[PDB]
Amino acid sequence: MMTFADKVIQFNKDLSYTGSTLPPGIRIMNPFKEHEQTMHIVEAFYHKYYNDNQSRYLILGINPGRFGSGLTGIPFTDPKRLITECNIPYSGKLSHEPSSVFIYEMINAFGGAEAFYKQFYISSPCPLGFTSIAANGKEKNYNYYDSKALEKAVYEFIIENIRKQLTLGITTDTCFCLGTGKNEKFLMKVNAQYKFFKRIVALEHPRFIMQYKTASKQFYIDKYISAFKALNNS
C-alpha cells in the first residue's frame, strides 16, 4: 500500500489476536472489530493526516481501552476530540477520555493536529485491549502489564506488533514512551533485547497527568513539547 495512511489502514483491517490463551475472565478488545463505524473513522483520520510517504517518529502509549478512543480507533482521540479537533464526524454516544483532553491541548500548543501528525505517529506496544466483567456487572479494562500471566500471554504478540509498526516508515533515533511506570520498564527491557531504537524517552502518561497532576497540566504540556523540540533541535 502506497502511503503511510494506506499501510496503517491495512494494518488495522488485518489486526487479529495471535497470542496465547488469556487469563480467566479476560476478553480481547479489538476496536476495529467492535463497531462498524471504527474502520470508517480510521480511513478518514489517516487519509487526512498521513497522506504521504514521509517518515514519522513513533510515540507509544500502553494499549487501547473499550471507552473513549476505543470507540474511534484513533489513539488518544475520543469522539469529542475527533469532532472538534479533527473535524471528523462521529455518530453515537460520546465517551470522555481524560488522556484525549490532555493530548489535544498539547497538540494545539505544538502547532495543531496537521503539523503534529505530520511528524509523529502514535501507537502502542499491544495494539489490542482487554476487558473483564465483574459479578456486579462493572467492566474493567486492563493494561498488558497488569499481571505476569497476561504479559506472558501477549508478549510475542507485542514484539510482533512493534516490528510491524516499524515497517511503516519510522525514524528510529527516539521512541517516546508514554508512561513512566511499568510501560517504561517493559519498553526498556524490549529495547535492550531487540535494539529497535537508538534511545527511548519516557514521558508521564496523559492519564496520570490528568488524574494526579491536573493543576500542573501546563507544565506537562511544556515537558512534552520540550522533548519533541530537543529531538528536532539535535
Tab-separated table of C-alpha atoms in Angstrom:
chain	number	residue	atom	x	y	z
A	1	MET	CA	0.000	0.000	0.000
A	2	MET	CA	1.457	3.334	-1.090
A	3	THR	CA	1.046	5.960	1.622
A	4	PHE	CA	1.755	5.798	5.337
A	5	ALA	CA	-2.023	6.037	5.806
A	6	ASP	CA	-2.648	3.127	3.428
A	7	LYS	CA	-0.293	0.936	5.460
A	8	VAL	CA	-1.824	1.909	8.822
A	9	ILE	CA	-5.321	1.284	7.444
A	10	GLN	CA	-4.357	-2.174	6.168
A	11	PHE	CA	-2.660	-2.992	9.490
A	12	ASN	CA	-5.814	-2.127	11.396
A	13	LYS	CA	-8.038	-4.063	8.964
A	14	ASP	CA	-5.892	-7.177	9.331
A	15	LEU	CA	-5.209	-6.946	13.060
A	16	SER	CA	-6.232	-10.069	14.964
A	17	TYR	CA	-5.075	-11.552	18.256
A	18	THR	CA	-2.419	-14.225	17.701
A	19	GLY	CA	-1.028	-14.514	21.253
A	20	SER	CA	-1.596	-17.231	23.842
A	21	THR	CA	-4.726	-18.103	25.824
A	22	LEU	CA	-5.573	-15.216	28.145
A	23	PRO	CA	-6.077	-15.486	31.925
A	24	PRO	CA	-9.570	-16.312	33.244
A	25	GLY	CA	-12.194	-13.636	32.757
A	26	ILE	CA	-10.231	-11.569	30.213
A	27	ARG	CA	-11.535	-10.926	26.694
A	28	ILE	CA	-9.598	-9.367	23.825
A	29	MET	CA	-10.911	-5.915	22.883
A	30	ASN	CA	-10.250	-5.144	19.205
A	31	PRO	CA	-11.573	-1.629	18.422
A	32	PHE	CA	-11.519	-2.272	14.676
A	33	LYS	CA	-13.768	-5.322	15.017
A	34	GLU	CA	-16.046	-3.909	17.769
A	35	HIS	CA	-18.184	-1.471	15.749
A	36	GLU	CA	-18.583	-0.907	12.013
A	37	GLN	CA	-18.009	2.860	12.374
A	38	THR	CA	-14.455	2.438	13.658
A	39	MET	CA	-12.756	1.487	10.397
A	40	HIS	CA	-14.614	4.298	8.590
A	41	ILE	CA	-13.108	6.751	11.089
A	42	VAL	CA	-9.695	5.091	10.724
A	43	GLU	CA	-9.816	5.658	6.972
A	44	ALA	CA	-10.957	9.266	7.376
A	45	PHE	CA	-8.337	10.106	10.000
A	46	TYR	CA	-5.249	8.543	8.446
A	47	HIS	CA	-6.112	9.772	4.945
A	48	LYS	CA	-6.383	13.271	6.410
A	49	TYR	CA	-3.121	13.377	8.354
A	50	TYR	CA	-0.847	10.648	6.950
A	51	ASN	CA	-1.485	11.056	3.218
A	52	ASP	CA	2.199	10.964	2.270
A	53	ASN	CA	5.337	8.826	2.314
A	54	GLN	CA	7.351	10.815	4.837
A	55	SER	CA	8.787	9.043	7.844
A	56	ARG	CA	7.410	9.573	11.350
A	57	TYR	CA	8.688	9.412	14.895
A	58	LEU	CA	6.869	6.786	16.963
A	59	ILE	CA	5.030	7.626	20.199
A	60	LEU	CA	3.915	4.586	22.203
A	61	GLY	CA	1.049	4.529	24.684
A	62	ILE	CA	0.102	1.436	26.667
A	63	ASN	CA	-2.855	-0.205	24.898
A	64	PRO	CA	-6.434	0.640	23.889
A	65	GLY	CA	-9.391	0.583	26.232
A	66	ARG	CA	-13.009	-0.029	25.329
A	67	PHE	CA	-14.066	3.559	26.121
A	68	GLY	CA	-13.060	6.863	24.583
A	69	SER	CA	-10.539	6.312	21.798
A	70	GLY	CA	-11.635	2.661	21.747
A	71	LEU	CA	-14.797	3.923	20.046
A	72	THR	CA	-12.875	5.826	17.360
A	73	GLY	CA	-9.921	3.527	16.723
A	74	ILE	CA	-7.657	6.615	16.781
A	75	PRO	CA	-5.063	6.764	19.598
A	76	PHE	CA	-5.846	9.345	22.307
A	77	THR	CA	-8.740	10.696	20.196
A	78	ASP	CA	-12.128	10.254	21.874
A	79	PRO	CA	-15.353	11.106	19.993
A	80	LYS	CA	-15.461	14.711	21.208
A	81	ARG	CA	-11.857	15.360	20.177
A	82	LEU	CA	-12.476	13.611	16.856
A	83	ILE	CA	-15.352	16.010	16.158
A	84	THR	CA	-13.924	19.272	17.469
A	85	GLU	CA	-10.182	18.889	16.818
A	86	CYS	CA	-10.032	16.627	13.745
A	87	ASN	CA	-13.357	17.821	12.235
A	88	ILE	CA	-14.329	14.208	11.544
A	89	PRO	CA	-17.953	13.294	12.323
A	90	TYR	CA	-18.916	10.699	14.901
A	91	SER	CA	-22.330	9.079	15.303
A	92	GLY	CA	-23.435	7.812	18.671
A	93	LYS	CA	-22.741	8.211	22.337
A	94	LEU	CA	-19.858	10.404	23.375
A	95	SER	CA	-17.243	8.859	25.637
A	96	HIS	CA	-14.934	11.050	27.715
A	97	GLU	CA	-11.241	10.105	27.752
A	98	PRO	CA	-9.184	12.417	30.006
A	99	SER	CA	-5.978	11.462	28.170
A	100	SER	CA	-7.555	12.781	24.976
A	101	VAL	CA	-8.176	16.205	26.530
A	102	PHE	CA	-4.520	16.431	27.527
A	103	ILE	CA	-3.150	15.165	24.228
A	104	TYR	CA	-5.107	17.638	22.125
A	105	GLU	CA	-4.265	20.572	24.395
A	106	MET	CA	-0.638	19.522	23.893
A	107	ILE	CA	-1.163	19.193	20.128
A	108	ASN	CA	-2.654	22.669	19.893
A	109	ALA	CA	0.292	24.040	21.904
A	110	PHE	CA	2.608	22.254	19.431
A	111	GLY	CA	1.039	23.969	16.420
A	112	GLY	CA	-2.067	21.962	15.602
A	113	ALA	CA	-3.080	18.468	14.542
A	114	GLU	CA	-1.837	18.782	10.957
A	115	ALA	CA	1.675	19.852	11.986
A	116	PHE	CA	1.933	17.348	14.832
A	117	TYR	CA	0.665	14.368	12.857
A	118	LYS	CA	2.960	15.376	10.005
A	119	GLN	CA	5.850	14.494	12.342
A	120	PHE	CA	4.547	11.882	14.807
A	121	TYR	CA	2.582	8.639	14.732
A	122	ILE	CA	1.007	7.263	17.925
A	123	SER	CA	0.611	3.519	18.519
A	124	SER	CA	1.027	1.178	21.491
A	125	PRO	CA	3.116	-1.949	22.188
A	126	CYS	CA	-0.037	-4.003	22.494
A	127	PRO	CA	-2.449	-2.891	19.733
A	128	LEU	CA	-5.488	-4.519	21.384
A	129	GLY	CA	-7.159	-4.016	24.747
A	130	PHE	CA	-8.544	-6.368	27.380
A	131	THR	CA	-11.755	-6.360	29.420
A	132	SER	CA	-13.393	-8.350	32.176
A	133	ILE	CA	-16.871	-8.074	33.688
A	134	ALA	CA	-17.368	-8.413	37.447
A	135	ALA	CA	-20.164	-10.158	39.342
A	136	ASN	CA	-21.660	-6.689	39.900
A	137	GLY	CA	-21.607	-6.130	36.126
A	138	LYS	CA	-18.953	-3.401	36.085
A	139	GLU	CA	-16.449	-3.654	33.235
A	140	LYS	CA	-12.694	-3.411	33.832
A	141	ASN	CA	-10.049	-2.507	31.250
A	142	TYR	CA	-6.530	-3.879	31.652
A	143	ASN	CA	-3.038	-2.800	30.709
A	144	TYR	CA	-0.988	-5.556	29.090
A	145	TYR	CA	1.395	-5.478	32.069
A	146	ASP	CA	-1.239	-5.729	34.798
A	147	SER	CA	-0.176	-9.292	35.680
A	148	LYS	CA	2.710	-11.588	34.834
A	149	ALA	CA	0.267	-14.064	33.289
A	150	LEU	CA	-1.336	-11.505	30.963
A	151	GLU	CA	2.041	-10.114	29.896
A	152	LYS	CA	3.371	-13.620	29.296
A	153	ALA	CA	0.341	-14.432	27.169
A	154	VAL	CA	0.676	-11.367	24.923
A	155	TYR	CA	4.488	-10.959	24.903
A	156	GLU	CA	5.306	-12.339	21.441
A	157	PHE	CA	2.183	-10.673	20.030
A	158	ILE	CA	3.561	-7.358	21.348
A	159	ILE	CA	7.035	-7.855	19.870
A	160	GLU	CA	5.477	-8.726	16.509
A	161	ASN	CA	3.325	-5.604	16.698
A	162	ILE	CA	6.314	-3.346	17.413
A	163	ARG	CA	8.207	-4.840	14.459
A	164	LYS	CA	5.159	-4.357	12.220
A	165	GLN	CA	4.811	-0.723	13.313
A	166	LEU	CA	8.443	-0.111	12.419
A	167	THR	CA	7.730	-1.223	8.853
A	168	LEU	CA	5.516	1.877	8.395
A	169	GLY	CA	8.494	4.204	7.898
A	170	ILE	CA	9.669	5.211	11.357
A	171	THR	CA	12.676	7.350	12.263
A	172	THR	CA	14.181	5.126	14.945
A	173	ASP	CA	16.525	7.579	16.717
A	174	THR	CA	13.997	8.199	19.507
A	175	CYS	CA	10.835	6.392	20.508
A	176	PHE	CA	8.648	8.240	23.002
A	177	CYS	CA	7.179	6.080	25.773
A	178	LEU	CA	4.052	7.438	27.453
A	179	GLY	CA	4.021	6.037	30.970
A	180	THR	CA	6.974	6.287	33.341
A	181	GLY	CA	5.965	3.207	35.305
A	182	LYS	CA	5.559	-0.318	34.018
A	183	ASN	CA	5.274	0.779	30.368
A	184	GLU	CA	8.750	2.286	30.591
A	185	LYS	CA	10.218	-0.770	32.328
A	186	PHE	CA	8.748	-3.066	29.673
A	187	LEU	CA	9.906	-0.993	26.722
A	188	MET	CA	13.413	-0.577	28.159
A	189	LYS	CA	13.704	-4.355	28.537
A	190	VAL	CA	12.394	-4.814	24.988
A	191	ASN	CA	14.729	-2.225	23.516
A	192	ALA	CA	17.721	-3.711	25.283
A	193	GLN	CA	16.803	-7.101	23.808
A	194	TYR	CA	15.959	-6.130	20.200
A	195	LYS	CA	17.640	-2.708	19.732
A	196	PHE	CA	14.642	-1.249	17.886
A	197	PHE	CA	15.509	2.352	18.772
A	198	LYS	CA	18.659	4.307	19.464
A	199	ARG	CA	17.018	5.684	22.618
A	200	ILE	CA	13.679	5.784	24.422
A	201	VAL	CA	12.410	8.995	26.032
A	202	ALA	CA	9.716	8.389	28.654
A	203	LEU	CA	7.062	10.997	29.463
A	204	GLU	CA	4.328	10.857	32.104
A	205	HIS	CA	1.239	9.197	30.651
A	206	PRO	CA	-1.623	11.628	29.843
A	207	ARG	CA	-3.959	9.675	32.149
A	208	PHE	CA	-1.537	10.058	35.059
A	209	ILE	CA	-1.190	13.787	34.294
A	210	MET	CA	-4.947	14.285	34.144
A	211	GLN	CA	-5.573	12.291	37.313
A	212	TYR	CA	-2.700	13.262	39.636
A	213	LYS	CA	-1.030	16.356	38.125
A	214	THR	CA	-4.203	18.065	36.933
A	215	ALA	CA	-3.376	21.543	38.272
A	216	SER	CA	0.013	21.145	36.550
A	217	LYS	CA	-1.260	20.217	33.077
A	218	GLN	CA	0.543	23.182	31.505
A	219	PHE	CA	3.914	22.093	32.845
A	220	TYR	CA	3.424	18.662	31.314
A	221	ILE	CA	2.385	20.200	28.011
A	222	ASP	CA	5.673	22.092	28.039
A	223	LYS	CA	7.562	18.965	29.049
A	224	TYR	CA	6.171	17.062	26.069
A	225	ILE	CA	6.899	19.876	23.680
A	226	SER	CA	10.396	20.311	25.033
A	227	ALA	CA	11.113	16.637	24.366
A	228	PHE	CA	9.903	16.937	20.774
A	229	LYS	CA	11.898	20.156	20.312
A	230	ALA	CA	15.141	18.664	21.684
A	231	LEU	CA	14.717	15.813	19.217
A	232	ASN	CA	14.191	18.331	16.426
A	233	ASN	CA	16.919	20.668	17.754
A	234	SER	CA	19.628	17.995	17.567
